[PDB]
mmCIF file with all atom_site columns, C-alpha atoms and ligand atoms in Angstrom:
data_model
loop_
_atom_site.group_PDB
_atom_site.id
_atom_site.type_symbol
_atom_site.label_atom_id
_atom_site.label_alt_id
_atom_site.label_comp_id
_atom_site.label_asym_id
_atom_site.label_entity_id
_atom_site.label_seq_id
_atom_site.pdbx_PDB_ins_code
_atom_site.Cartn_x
_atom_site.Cartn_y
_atom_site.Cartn_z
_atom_site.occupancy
_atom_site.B_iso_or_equiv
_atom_site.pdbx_formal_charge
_atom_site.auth_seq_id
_atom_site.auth_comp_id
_atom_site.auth_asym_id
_atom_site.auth_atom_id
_atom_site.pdbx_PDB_model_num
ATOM   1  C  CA  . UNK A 1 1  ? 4.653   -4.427  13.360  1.00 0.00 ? 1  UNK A CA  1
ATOM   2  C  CA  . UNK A 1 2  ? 3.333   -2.145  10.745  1.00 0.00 ? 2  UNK A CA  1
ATOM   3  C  CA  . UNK A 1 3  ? 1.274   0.912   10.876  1.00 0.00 ? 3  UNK A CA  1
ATOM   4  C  CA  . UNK A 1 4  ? -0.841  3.433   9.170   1.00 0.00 ? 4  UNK A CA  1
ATOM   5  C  CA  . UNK A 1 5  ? -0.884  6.966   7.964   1.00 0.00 ? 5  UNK A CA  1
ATOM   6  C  CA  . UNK A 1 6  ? -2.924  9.359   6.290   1.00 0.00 ? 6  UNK A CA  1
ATOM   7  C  CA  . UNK A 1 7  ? -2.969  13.406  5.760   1.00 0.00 ? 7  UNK A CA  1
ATOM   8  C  CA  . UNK A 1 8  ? -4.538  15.115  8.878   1.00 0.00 ? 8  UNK A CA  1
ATOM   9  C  CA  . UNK A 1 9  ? -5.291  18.006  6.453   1.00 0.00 ? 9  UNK A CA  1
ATOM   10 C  CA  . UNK A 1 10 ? -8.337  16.193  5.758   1.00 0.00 ? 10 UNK A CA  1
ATOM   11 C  CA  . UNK A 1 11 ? -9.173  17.889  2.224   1.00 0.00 ? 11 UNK A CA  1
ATOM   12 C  CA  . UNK A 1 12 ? -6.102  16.882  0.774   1.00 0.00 ? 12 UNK A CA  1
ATOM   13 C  CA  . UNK A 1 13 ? -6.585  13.281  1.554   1.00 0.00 ? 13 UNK A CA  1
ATOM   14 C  CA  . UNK A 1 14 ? -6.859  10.598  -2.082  1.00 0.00 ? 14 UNK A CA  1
ATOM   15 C  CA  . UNK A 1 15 ? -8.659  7.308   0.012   1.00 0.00 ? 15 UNK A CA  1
ATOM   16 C  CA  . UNK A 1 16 ? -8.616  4.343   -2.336  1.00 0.00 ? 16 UNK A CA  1
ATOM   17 C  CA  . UNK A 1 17 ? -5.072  4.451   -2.796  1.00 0.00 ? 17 UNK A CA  1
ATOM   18 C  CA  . UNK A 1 18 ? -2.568  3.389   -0.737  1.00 0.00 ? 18 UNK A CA  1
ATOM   19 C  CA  . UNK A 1 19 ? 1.006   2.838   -0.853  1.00 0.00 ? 19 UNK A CA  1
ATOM   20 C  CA  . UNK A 1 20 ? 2.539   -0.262  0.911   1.00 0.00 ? 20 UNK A CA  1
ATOM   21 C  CA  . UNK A 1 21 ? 6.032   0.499   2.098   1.00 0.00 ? 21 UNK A CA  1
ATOM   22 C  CA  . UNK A 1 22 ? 7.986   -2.661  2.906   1.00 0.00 ? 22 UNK A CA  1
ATOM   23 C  CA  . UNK A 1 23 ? 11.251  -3.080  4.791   1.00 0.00 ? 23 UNK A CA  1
ATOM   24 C  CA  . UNK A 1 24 ? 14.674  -1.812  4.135   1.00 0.00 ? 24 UNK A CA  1
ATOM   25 C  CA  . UNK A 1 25 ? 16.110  -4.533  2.016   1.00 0.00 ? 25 UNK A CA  1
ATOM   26 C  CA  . UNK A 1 26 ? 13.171  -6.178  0.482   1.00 0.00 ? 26 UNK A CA  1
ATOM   27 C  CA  . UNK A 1 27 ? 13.848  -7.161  -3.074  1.00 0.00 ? 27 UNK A CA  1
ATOM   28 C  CA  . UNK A 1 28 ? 11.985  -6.245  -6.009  1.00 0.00 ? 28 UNK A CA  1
ATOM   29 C  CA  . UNK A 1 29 ? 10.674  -10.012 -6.388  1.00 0.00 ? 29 UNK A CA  1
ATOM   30 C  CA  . UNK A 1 30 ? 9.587   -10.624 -2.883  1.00 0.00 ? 30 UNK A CA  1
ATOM   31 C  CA  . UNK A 1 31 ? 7.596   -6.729  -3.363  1.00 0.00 ? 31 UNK A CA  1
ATOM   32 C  CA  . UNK A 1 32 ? 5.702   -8.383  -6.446  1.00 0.00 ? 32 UNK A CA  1
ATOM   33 C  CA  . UNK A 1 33 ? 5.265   -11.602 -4.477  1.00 0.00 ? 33 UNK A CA  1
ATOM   34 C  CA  . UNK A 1 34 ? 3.396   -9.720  -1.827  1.00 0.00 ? 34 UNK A CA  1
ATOM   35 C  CA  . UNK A 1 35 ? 1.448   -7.492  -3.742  1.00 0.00 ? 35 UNK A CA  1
ATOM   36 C  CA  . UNK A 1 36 ? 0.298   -10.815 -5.576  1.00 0.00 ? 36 UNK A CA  1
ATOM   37 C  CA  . UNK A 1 37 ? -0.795  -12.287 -2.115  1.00 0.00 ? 37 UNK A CA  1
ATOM   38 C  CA  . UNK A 1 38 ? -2.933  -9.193  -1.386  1.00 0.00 ? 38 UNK A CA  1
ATOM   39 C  CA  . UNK A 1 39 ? -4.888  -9.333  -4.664  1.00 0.00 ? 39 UNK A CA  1
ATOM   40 C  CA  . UNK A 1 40 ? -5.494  -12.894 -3.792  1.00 0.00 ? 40 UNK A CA  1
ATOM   41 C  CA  . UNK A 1 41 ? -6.507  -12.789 -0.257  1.00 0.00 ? 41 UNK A CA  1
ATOM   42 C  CA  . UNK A 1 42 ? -8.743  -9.699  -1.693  1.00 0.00 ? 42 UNK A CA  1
ATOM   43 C  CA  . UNK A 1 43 ? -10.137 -11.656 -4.317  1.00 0.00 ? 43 UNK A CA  1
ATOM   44 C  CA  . UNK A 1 44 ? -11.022 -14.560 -1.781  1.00 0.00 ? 44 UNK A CA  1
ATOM   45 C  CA  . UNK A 1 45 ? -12.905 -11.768 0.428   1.00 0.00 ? 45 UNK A CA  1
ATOM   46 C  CA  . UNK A 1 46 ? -15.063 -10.248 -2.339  1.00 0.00 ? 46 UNK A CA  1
ATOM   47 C  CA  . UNK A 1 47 ? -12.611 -7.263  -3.010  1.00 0.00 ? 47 UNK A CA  1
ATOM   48 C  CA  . UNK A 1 48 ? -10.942 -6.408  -6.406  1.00 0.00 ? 48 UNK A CA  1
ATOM   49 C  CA  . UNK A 1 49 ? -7.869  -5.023  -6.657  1.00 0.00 ? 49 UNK A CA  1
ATOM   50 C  CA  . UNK A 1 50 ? -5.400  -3.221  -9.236  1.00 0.00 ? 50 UNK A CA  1
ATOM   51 C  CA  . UNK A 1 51 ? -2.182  -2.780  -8.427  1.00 0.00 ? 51 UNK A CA  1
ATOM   52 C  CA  . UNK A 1 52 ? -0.966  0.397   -9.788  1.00 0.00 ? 52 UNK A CA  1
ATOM   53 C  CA  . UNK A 1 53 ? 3.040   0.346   -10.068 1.00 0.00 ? 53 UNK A CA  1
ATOM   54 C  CA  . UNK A 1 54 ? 5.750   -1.709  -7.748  1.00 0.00 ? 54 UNK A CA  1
ATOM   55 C  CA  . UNK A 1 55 ? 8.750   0.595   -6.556  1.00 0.00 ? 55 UNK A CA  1
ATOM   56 C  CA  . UNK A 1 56 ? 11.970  -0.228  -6.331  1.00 0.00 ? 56 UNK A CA  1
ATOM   57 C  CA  . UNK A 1 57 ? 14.980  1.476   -6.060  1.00 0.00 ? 57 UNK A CA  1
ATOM   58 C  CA  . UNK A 1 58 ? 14.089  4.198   -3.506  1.00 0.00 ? 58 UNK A CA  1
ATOM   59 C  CA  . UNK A 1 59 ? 12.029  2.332   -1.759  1.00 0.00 ? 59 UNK A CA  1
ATOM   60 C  CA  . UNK A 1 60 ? 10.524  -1.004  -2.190  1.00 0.00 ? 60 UNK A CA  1
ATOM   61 C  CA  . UNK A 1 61 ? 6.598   -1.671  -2.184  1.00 0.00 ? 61 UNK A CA  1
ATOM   62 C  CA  . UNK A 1 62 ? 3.683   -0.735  -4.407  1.00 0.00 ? 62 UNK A CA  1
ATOM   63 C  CA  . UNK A 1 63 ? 0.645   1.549   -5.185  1.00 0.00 ? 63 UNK A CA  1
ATOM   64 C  CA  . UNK A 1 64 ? -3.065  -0.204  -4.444  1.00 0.00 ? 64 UNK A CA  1
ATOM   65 C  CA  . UNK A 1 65 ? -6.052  1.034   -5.500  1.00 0.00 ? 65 UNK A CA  1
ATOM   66 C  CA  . UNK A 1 66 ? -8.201  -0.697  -3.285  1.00 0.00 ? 66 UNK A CA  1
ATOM   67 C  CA  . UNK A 1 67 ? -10.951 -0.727  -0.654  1.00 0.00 ? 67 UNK A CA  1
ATOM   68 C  CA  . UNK A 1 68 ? -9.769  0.612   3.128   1.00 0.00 ? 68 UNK A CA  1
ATOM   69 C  CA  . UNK A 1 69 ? -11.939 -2.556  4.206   1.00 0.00 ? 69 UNK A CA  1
ATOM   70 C  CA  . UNK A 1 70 ? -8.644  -4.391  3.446   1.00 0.00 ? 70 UNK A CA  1
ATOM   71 C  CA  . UNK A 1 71 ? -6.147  -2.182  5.566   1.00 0.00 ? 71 UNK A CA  1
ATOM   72 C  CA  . UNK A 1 72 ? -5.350  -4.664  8.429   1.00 0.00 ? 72 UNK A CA  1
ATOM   73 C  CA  . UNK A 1 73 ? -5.317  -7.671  6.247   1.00 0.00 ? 73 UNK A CA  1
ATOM   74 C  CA  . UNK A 1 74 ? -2.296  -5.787  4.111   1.00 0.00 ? 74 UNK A CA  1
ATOM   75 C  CA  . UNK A 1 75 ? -0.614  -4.970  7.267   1.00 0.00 ? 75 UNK A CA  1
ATOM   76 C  CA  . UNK A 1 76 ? -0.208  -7.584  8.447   1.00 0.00 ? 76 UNK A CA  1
ATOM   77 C  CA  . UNK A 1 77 ? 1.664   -9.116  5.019   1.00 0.00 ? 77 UNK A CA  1
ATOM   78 C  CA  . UNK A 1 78 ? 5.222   -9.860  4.904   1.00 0.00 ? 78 UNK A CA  1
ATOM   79 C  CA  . UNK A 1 79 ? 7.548   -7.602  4.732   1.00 0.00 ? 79 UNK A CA  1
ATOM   80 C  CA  . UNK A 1 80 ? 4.946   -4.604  5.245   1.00 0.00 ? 80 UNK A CA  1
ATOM   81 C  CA  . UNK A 1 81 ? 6.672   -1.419  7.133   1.00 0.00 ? 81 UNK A CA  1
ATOM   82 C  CA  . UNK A 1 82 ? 3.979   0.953   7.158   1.00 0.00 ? 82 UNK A CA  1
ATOM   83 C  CA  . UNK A 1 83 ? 1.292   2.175   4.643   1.00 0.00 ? 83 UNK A CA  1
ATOM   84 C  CA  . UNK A 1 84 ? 0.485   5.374   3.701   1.00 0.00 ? 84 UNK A CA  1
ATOM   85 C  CA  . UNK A 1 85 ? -2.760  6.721   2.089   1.00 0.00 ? 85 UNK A CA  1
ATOM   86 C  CA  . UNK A 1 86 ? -2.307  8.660   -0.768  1.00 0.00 ? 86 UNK A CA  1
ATOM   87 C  CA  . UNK A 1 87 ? -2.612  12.512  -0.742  1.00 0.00 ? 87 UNK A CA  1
ATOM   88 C  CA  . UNK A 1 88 ? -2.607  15.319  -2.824  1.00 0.00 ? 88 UNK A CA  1
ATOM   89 C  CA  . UNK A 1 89 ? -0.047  17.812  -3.574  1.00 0.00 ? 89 UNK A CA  1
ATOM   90 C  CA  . UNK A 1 90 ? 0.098   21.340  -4.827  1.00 0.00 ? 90 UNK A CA  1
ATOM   91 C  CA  . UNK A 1 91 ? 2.570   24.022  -6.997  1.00 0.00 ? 91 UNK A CA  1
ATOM   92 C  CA  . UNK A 1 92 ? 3.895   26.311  -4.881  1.00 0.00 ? 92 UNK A CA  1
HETATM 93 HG HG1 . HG  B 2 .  ? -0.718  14.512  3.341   1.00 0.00 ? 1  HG  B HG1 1
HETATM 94 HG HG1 . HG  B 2 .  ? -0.481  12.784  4.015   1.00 0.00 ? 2  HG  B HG1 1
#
């Protein structure tokens, strides 16, 4: 069962972007597959969509830039681990 995380330093939170974080050994075609399914069952709700990049080889998932309306629908996609709201970061 998947969850949800943002920054709690609330300034240095990006909303509209979220990265979806699937399990372990999810394979690169099953990531597109799913990020596929939540542009559809977006589309069907009203909401568009653009998938920014799929990752694999650290990790496997993909960058949304997308309403937060649509946060339990994507959780509740296969393969979802967690998602993560994208945040900023600074030079040190
Ligand atoms: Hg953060
Ligand atoms: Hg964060």
């Amino acid at each position: 069962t998947a969850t949800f995380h943002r920054c709690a330093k609330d300034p240095w939170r990006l909303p509209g972007t979220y990265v979806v974080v699937l399990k372990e050994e999810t394979h690169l075609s099953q990531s597109e597959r799913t990020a596929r399914r939540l542009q559809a069952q977006a589309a069907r709700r009203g909401y568009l969509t653009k998938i920014l990049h799929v990752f694999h080889g650290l990790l496997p998932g993909f960058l949304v830039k997308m309403s937060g309306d649509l946060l339990e629908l994507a959780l509740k996609l296969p393969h979802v681990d967690y998602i993560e709201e994208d945040s900023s970061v600074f030079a040190q």
